[PDB]
Amino acid sequence: NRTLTREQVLALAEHIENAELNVHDIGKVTNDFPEMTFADAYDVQWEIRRRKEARGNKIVGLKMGLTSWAKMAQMGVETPIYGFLADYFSVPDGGVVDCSKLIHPKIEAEISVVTKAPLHGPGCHLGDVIAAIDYVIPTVEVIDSRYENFKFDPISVVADNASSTRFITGGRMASLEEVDLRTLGVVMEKNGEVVELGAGAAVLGHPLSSVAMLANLLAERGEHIPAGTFIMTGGITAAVPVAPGDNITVRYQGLGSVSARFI
Numbered sequence: 392n393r394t395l396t397r398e399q400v401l402a403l404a405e406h407i408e409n410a411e412l413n414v415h416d417i418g419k420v421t422n423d424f425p426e427m428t429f430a431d432a433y434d435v436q437w438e439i440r441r442r443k444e445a446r447g448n449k450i451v452g453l454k455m456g457l458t459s460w461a462k463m464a465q466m467g468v469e470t471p472i473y474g475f476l477a478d479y480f481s482v483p484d485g486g487v488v489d490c491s492k493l494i495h496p497k498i499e500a501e502i503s504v505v506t507k508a509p510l511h512g513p514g515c516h517l518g519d520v521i522a523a524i525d526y527v528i529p530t531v532e533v534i535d536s537r538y539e540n541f542k543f544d545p546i547s548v549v550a551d552n553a554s555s556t557r558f559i560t561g562g563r564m565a566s567l568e569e570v571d572l573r574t575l576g577v578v579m580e581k582n583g584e585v586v587e588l589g590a591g592a593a594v595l596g597h598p599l600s601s602v603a604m605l606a607n608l609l610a611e612r613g614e615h616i617p618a619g620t621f622i623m624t625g626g627i628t629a630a631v632p633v634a635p636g637d638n639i640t641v642r643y644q645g646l647g648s649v650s651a652r653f654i
C-alpha cells in the first residue's frame with residue numbers, strides 16, 4: 392500500500408519541511424505523486440518528524456484533523472488524520488505568534504488532553520479512553536498549510552504534518568469529572584468580535600473519541616499513545632484566518648480563555 396520509493400519519501404519530506412522552515416508555499420505533492428497513499432503520506436510525515444528530532448527538536452504532542460464526520464465524508468476518508476507537534480510549535484497563553492514565520496495561518500479552538508495511562512488500537516474506542524485521561528486543557532491551534540492550493544487534499548495534508556505549526560495552550564486545566572466535553576461551549580473572538588462558536592461535540596460527537604481514533608491510526612504503524620501524551624483532539628470551530636495585528640481570545644465554558652497576539 393505504498394507507491395513512493397524510499398528516496399522519494401526522503402525527498403518529499405525534505406521538500407515539504409523546507410516549505411515550512413523557509414515559509415514558502417509549494418504545490419500539493421499529490422499533483423506530482425498522484426499514486427501516493429496515506430501510508431506514503433505518513434511515511435513522509437514521520438520522516439519530517441525524524442528530521443526535526445535529528446536536529447534536536449522534542450516532539451511534544453499530537454494533533455488531529457478531519458475530526459468531523461461531515462468533512463470526512465466530504466473528503467471520502469473514513470477516519471481523521473493526525474500530525475505531530477514539535478516543541479517550537481508551543482506558544483504560551485497570551486503569547487505572540489510571529490506571522491512572518493508563517494504562510495497563511497488560521498486558528499482553530501480545541502480541547503486537548505494529557506493521558507496518564509497508555510492507549511492502543513486497533514479497536515480503541517471512547518470507553519478505553521476515559522480511564523486514561525489525566526486532564527483536559529483548552530488549546531488553540533495555529534494551522535498553516537504549506538500548500539499554495541485552495542482545495543483540501545487529505546493525502547498531501549498528512550504529508551505536510553496535517554498543517555501543524557503552532558499551538559497555544561491556556562485557560563484552565565480540568566479533570567474529566569469537572570467538564571462535560573460534548574457540551575463544552577467555545578467562543579472564538581478575534582479583535583474583540585465573536586467570529587466562531589461551537590461545542591466539544593463538534594469533534595466526532597465526542598472529543599475523546601478522537602483519542603481513540605488516534606490510537607487506532609497509530610496502531611496501523613505499530614505505534615501507540617504512551618501515558619503522558621498531549622493530544623489536540625480536533626477543531627471545535629471552523630478555522631479562522633489570522634494576520635499581523637490580530638488578537639484572539641477563545642473562551643471555554645468553565646475553563647477560562649486562551650489568547651494570542653499575532654504580529
Ligand SMILES: [Cl-]
Nearest residue numbers: 487488489492
Ligand atoms: Cl512564531
Ligand SMILES: [Cl-]
Nearest residue numbers: 539540541542
Ligand atoms: Cl487548488
